[PDB]
Amino acid sequence: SHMQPGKYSQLVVETIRRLGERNGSSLAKIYTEAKKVPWFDQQNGRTYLKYSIKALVQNDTLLQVKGTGANGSFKLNRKKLEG
């Protein structure tokens, strides 16, 4: 691995894919699914998800959801990340 876009961001994409979440999944819900891997940092990993998600919303890979389920809810858009 000489070039990865953050294994935490790749984990977020696939985490929301595991749940589906048509309405959007809270950062707390995504965190609970993301901490189930042994390589995941249980300490500062919540900040790593917070920043990975936010960067993916900036790349139009995730859609920022607010109000319906939680304050910071998030879901998949498309493979628009690289396209």
UniProtKB/Swiss-Prot annotation:
Organism whose genome encodes this protein: Homo sapiens (Human)
Localisation: Nucleus; Chromosome
Gene that encodes the chain: H1-10
Post-translational modification: Citrullination at Arg-22 (H1R54ci) by PADI4 takes place within the DNA-binding site of H1 and results in its displacement from chromatin and global chromatin decondensation, thereby promoting pluripotency and stem cell maintenance.
Protein name, per record: Histone H1.10
Modified residues (N6-acetyllysine): K7
Tissues expressing this chain: Expressed ubiquitously.
H15 domain location: 4-78
Disulfide bonds: none
Section of the entire sequence shown: 44 to 123 of 213
Family: Belongs to the histone H1/H5 family.
Residues with Citrulline modification: R22
